[PDB]
Amino acid sequence: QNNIVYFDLDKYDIRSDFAQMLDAHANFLRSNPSYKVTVEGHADERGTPEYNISLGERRANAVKMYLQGKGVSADQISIVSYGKEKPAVLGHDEAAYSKNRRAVLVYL
């Protein structure tokens, strides 16, 4: 919950409510130059699998650009879009879709 950015339908911009959250990750990455974050981007099920990769990518790339704007080296950030392949929750309403439109920061 301190490592997930959520997005509206066909939106990929970093909302203010996630700024503080991401700032903490940027602080950690700057202070620890050997660590790499992987940003895993996701889409909801509406659409098609290969195209929806791009919706996950735009979300994950937005996190990357935000972190780079906070001084993080490009080589400490990787992105991997899972498109609609790895839903957080099952379901066919906005409750599920909103939970699934996300970028997750993980230290693997």
Binding site: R46, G47, E50, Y51, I53, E57, L90, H92
Partner: protein, 412 residues
Amino acid sequence: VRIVIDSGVDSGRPIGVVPFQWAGPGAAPEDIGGIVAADLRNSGKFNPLDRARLPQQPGSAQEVQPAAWSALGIDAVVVGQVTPNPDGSYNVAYQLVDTGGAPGTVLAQNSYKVNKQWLRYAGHTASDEVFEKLTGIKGAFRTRIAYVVQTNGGQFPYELRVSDYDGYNQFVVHRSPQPLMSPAWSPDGSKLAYVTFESGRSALVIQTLANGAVRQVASFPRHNGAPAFSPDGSKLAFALSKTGSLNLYVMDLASGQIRQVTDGRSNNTEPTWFPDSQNLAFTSDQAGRPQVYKVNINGGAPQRITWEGSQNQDADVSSDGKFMVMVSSNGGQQHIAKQDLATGGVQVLSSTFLDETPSLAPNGTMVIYSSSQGMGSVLNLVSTDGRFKARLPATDGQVKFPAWSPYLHHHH
């Protein structure tokens, strides 16, 4: 999986398919007549007479009584024989007999010598010959399908599988702890390209089915996916997003040389070949919402070709190049649609929920695709005229990413 038909048979051409004669004691090793009847029904074009109702059960063309079948509005009858060979193989023979305007004439016949494990194949060959003789369309009954099954739980929840088009003779191509995407057939039917996330990121690979050999195609940073083999056997199209958005690339299979085909800031993916092995249809979001575009790999700007609804994507071009099927969206629903590539005319084919990844049978008469039923993905069939609808239910796991094989150039 197995085929369950939901609608469309009643309107089909009535035909008589008689149980095949068996030269031995007890039951035949396989029900060849049953295979032929099922295949013809599965095509959406035929209505085989129920066994409760056969007016006679002739074991040869000479035993056919044409009048018994014209009385029922049946203008053709399939009869046949299965016989054992001393080497342990079988002969499977059929005769297609006219019971209409040329009563008693044999329209087609053949015999196949097969081992016990290839008896279904023999049945499908008979079906293919009957189907082509009567309809003028090449049969697809000897084809296979590829698909991904995702189980709940286990170390390897994702499996890429292959079966005959009707579900029989299923086997596992690859098991994975992470998602598998977008299997694509080589035109010789020997290989599948597919995407795996098992390494922690996407990799695009080609696997040879007979021995499991794997060739790595691409695992650049970001996405590597959406493969499609050219019909001429020379190239693989695919999408990579290493440049910052999805773009199309082509690999010369002989040399392994990769060439970039698109370089837009837009996303360009889901390529599908035209029959010439030079033109692709593909999805681009250049215009805003996804639409289907066409481009020649050798030069020129992509041209938008779709205007249906609000959004169109994920196309599959027919083997003759006359039409494509695709996923068309609005407002809040998405279905399989067919577009005539000469006129721009469109017909929506399906009414199921969250329709995706349509793949045409090699004779262009049938579409396999995936939809959502309850909480999970399932496989569906719809004819290209929209009249015939069926499903391929599985006993366990979600089923998705179907791909129909090309024609041919414990197993049973």
